[PDB]
Amino acid sequence: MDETGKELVLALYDYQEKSPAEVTMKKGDILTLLNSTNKDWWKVEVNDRQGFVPAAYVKKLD
């Protein structure tokens, strides 16, 4: 049960999910990267929630 055991990212700012394919993140949270094939939106996993967030709101930790 280590869904956060993947490519990690840092949440630079607070974000609120707008669509069912979006997830809410908070500044200072460590997000898990699931898909970064998009330049503007990155699919991440927070705790248990999977969805997309602004790529400009997240930074590669690795």
């Binding site: 974000y15 898909n35 998009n38 939106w41 997309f52 602004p54 400009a56 709101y57």
Partner: peptide
């Protein structure tokens, strides 16, 4: 994947 531009960084 959202087919639109994401919100600008605050």
């Amino acid at each position: 994947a959202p087919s639109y531009s994401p919100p600008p960084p605050p």
